[PDB]
Amino acid sequence: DLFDFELPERLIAQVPLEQRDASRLMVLDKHTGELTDSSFKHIISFFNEGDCLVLNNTRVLPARLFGTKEDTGAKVELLLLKQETGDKWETLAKPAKRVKKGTVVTFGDGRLKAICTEELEHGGRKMEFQYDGIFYEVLESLGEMPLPPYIKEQLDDKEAAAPTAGLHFTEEILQQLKDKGVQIEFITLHVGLGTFRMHAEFYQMSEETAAALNKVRENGGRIISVGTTSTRTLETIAGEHDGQFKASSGWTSIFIYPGYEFKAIDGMITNFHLPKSSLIMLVSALAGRENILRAYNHAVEEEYRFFSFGDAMLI
Numbered sequence: 001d002l003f004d005f006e007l008p009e010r011l012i013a014q015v016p017l018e019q020r021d022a023s024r025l026m027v028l029d030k031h032t033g034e035l036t037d038s039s040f041k042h043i044i045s046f047f048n049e050g051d052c053l054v055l056n057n058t059r060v061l062p063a064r065l066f067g068t069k070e071d072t073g074a075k076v077e078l079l080l081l082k083q084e085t086g087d088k089w090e091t092l093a094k095p096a097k098r099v100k101k102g103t104v105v106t107f108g109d110g111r112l113k114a115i116c117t118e119e120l121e122h123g124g125r126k127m128e129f130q131y132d133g134i135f136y137e138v139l140e141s142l143g144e145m146p147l148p149p150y151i152k153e154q155l156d157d158k159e160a161a162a163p164t165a166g167l168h169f170t171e172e173i174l175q176q177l178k179d180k181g182v183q184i185e186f187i188t189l190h191v192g193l194g195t196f197r198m199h200a201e202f203y204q205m206s207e208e209t210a211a212a213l214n215k216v217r218e219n220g221g222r223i224i225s226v227g228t229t230s231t232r233t234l235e236t237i238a239g240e241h242d243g244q245f246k247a248s249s250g251w252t253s254i255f256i257y258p259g260y261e262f263k264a265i266d267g268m269i270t271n272f273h274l275p276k277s278s279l280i281m282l283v284s285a286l287a288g289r290e291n292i293l294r295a296y297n298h299a300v301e302e303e304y305r306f307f308s309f310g311d312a313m314l315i
Contacts, residue, residue: 024037043173076094089127183212280296
């Protein structure tokens, strides 16, 4: 194989040195292929002003409502993605097929129902809630409301941990970078959602976030993704708009590999990976298969910790 090398199961960090910024930092020059070393404290010494960091920030926030298809029999699960205007929301629905045109779904005793004001491209569904009083209150209400048997039976119950090399980010460094003049933007990615369409991630970029990144691109700043993964979201987005960012959400399945021309990031921050997984190819497409390779060889040499909790890399 072409993305293989010697990787001592030992050089593979069993657990993390999460104590601090210790975690070394292999720095590779995308173009030149140079390959210096370092530690994650000096990090901030590589970012200029007008640079932005996109953080794959995650939130167990997909709140979900268990309603029942009004008219017909029943059973509809809604995943609340983002509230738009007033009482309209971006949503994912179980038994999606069931939710159509302007279908109506009831929740609980009927306080709060919702109509499907439209089908969405990513298979989601824009819905609109009907209710009295304060919305956020009504929900909270249903919060403590057990699922009626009717549904309850139709189910199996009642009513992880953000990986991403983006953890080496001491609240402090976050501040430093701010202070120095490096912006920080967030993207949102969800995992178990696949079952709402397969096992793809669901991303969401905001109007402001998109806006922000475009400025940076305009003003000639650099964009660096802090995401063993999020780099793909970005890449996906700017991919479908020609290097430009737009608010959006959807399923990400892009598979980056040598040859791919990045149109989103200028550099990224992740870890070292296995002698053939599909991450090395990603990275490899970024700085070239060779450069990365030799760096992988020198990383092993200077006994760098590889993978999940090992040391951090940058471009």
